[PDB]
């Protein structure tokens, strides 16, 4: 009920949600844990965390490199769940969503993956390469372990898809602002989808892809979305400041404070 509570709270405050993305273990475990605490302290409303995968086919260069850096550090899915448990032990109410690729959740059995998420305190799971057509087993397993199955609503979704996404999803609806892959490189009107989803009582929408400036988050809120997700803009700050961990944290702070202010 973490997302439910968060959204009610932001609504009472007439505010939009700012949700940053980072890869667990980038550039290292200790520095990553440190990055995440800074993100929260600077104002993040929720978190979208990617576990290192060898073949991230829905991600552009920036996030592709985040996975590579985590791999260089030796981060494994087991170490990720350990990281996830501690993040929750430190922050009791912040919604935590995992960005996963299918093989990592199917690998040891679908049911067992969602059981582990529950145990650690994860709130939602988005599997980037599983369309609604192939979602049944992931959906069912997530629901069985009180985990929200996140579905993606393309900018060109037809009515049948909107109706499906609204019925199946929970936590939040992932509103894609663009075709293509993740990247602050390309920016790329969602009023119709946002209204239709509301009509079908879908979970609150969070706009993702290409969001890298504060004007972009205010625009998302203005269009009717409950918030915005920003990844490459965040990871780029890590990439830029690798030789200065202290500089990194300070720079991350300014950016998410600025980004969060725009949702108010």
């Amino acid at each position: 009920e973490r997302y439910e509570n968060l959204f009610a709270q932001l609504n009472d405050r007439r505010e939009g949600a700012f949700v940053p993305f980072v890869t667990l273990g980038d550039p290292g475990i200790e520095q990553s844990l440190k990055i995440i605490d800074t993100l929260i302290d600077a104002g993040a409303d929720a978190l979208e965390l990617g576990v290192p995968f060898s073949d991230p086919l829905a991600d552009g260069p920036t996030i592709q490199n985040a996975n590579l850096r985590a791999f260089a550090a030796g981060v494994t899915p087991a170490q990720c769940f350990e990281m996830l448990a501690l993040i929750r032990e430190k922050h009791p109410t912040i919604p935590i969503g995992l960005l996963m690729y299918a093989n990592l959740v199917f690998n040891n059995g679908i049911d067992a993956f969602y059981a582990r998420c529950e145990q650690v305190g994860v709130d939602s799971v988005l599997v980037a390469d599983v369309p609604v057509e192939e979602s049944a087993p992931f959906r069912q397993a997530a629901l069985r372990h009180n985990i929200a199955p996140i579905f993606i609503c393309p900018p060109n979704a037809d009515d049948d898809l909107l109706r499906q996404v609204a019925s199946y999803g929970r936590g939040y609806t992932y509103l894609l602002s663009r075709s293509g892959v993740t990247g602050a490189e390309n920016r790329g009107p969602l009023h119709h989808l946002i209204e239709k989803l509301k009509e079908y009582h879908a979970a609150p929408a969070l706009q993702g892809f290409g969001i890298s400036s504060p004007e972009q988050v205010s625009a998302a809120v203005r269009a009717g979305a409950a918030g915005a997700i920003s990844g490459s803009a965040i990871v780029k700050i890590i990439e830029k400041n690798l030789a200065s961990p202290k500089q990194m944290l300070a720079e991350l702070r300014s950016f998410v404070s600025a980004m969060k202010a725009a949702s108010r």
């Binding site: 073949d55 199917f106 690998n107 369309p131 293509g180």
Partner: protein, 387 residues
Amino acid sequence: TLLNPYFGEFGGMYVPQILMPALNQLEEAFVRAQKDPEFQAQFADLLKNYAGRPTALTKCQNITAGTRTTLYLKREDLLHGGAHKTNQVLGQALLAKRMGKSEIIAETGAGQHGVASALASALLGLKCRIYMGAKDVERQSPNVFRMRLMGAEVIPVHSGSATLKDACNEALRDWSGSYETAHYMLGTAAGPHPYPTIVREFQRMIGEETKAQILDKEGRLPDAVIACVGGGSNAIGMFADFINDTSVGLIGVEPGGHGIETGEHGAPLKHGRVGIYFGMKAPMMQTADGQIEESYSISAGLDFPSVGPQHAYLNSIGRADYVSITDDEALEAFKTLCRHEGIIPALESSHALAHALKMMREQPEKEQLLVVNLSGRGDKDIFTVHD
């Protein structure tokens, strides 16, 4: 979907939501085309007058001397381009054209699919983009140069292991943002539906021709048809028309590399673990954690880290049997065909030959009528077997 995306437990459509309409579009176009005699006549014309179809079915008398085995080789090495891949790409290019598409995206490891895609695009007026891992481009300058000479844009991918796996990644990344003008010409009978079905249907000539040819020359169907399995296209092209002929054995050969026991191989179907990757549920080269691994083989063309879903299915129900052949075993078959038959086989194809040779040699007195699919020419491998 109009067609079943699964072969039992295997197959599916595991791609980001954004790419679903592209797959549904392709499926509809394929169903229509298959019904269209005009499309059919166009495909047949290119196959016959441009590619060299029908290919020969050659009896190998010297190789089987002193045994009760009769061996024939389906001559796909004689197809324009020197490999079976050409059949496939011509049909997929016509499908792209039928859809109003003007661009072609393609992935390649050893270079063959890239060369085939580049030639089909040059002939049919399509703008061709090819992704190749930086490691493969370095290791494959002759094919890169061929692709470029044919007008194709070659793009090195430096991500991950900078090999096939990664080229396959980049292609879908590109396609997710350009599907409206470009068509992704996948290189094997794998990936998300409708690709496994489409590639099979566009590779079906192989077995269909082999049937008529063997019936003419022997008045009997073969006891078994044998084919190497990298991703599964040449194999399924051979098998398809014989699936309902229950007396005909179907044998697929996977690369054993330095030996299964060493872990240095490319045999996911018989020695990997089922996973979900490349828009597909299928056996895969994978770590215990589920991180995708590379396939190894002396033959660069047998490096696809997974296998077509139809093969995984044909195996599970017992219709087809899969085995493996090591690097040294394939080298020997290569050497043998050169000296006794005057034909230089691709090292890929040599894995299939090596198995028919074992079948013979192991039981010399067994009466056996065998057909090996010689999927390609081996001029390519002269230097490799040289050093």
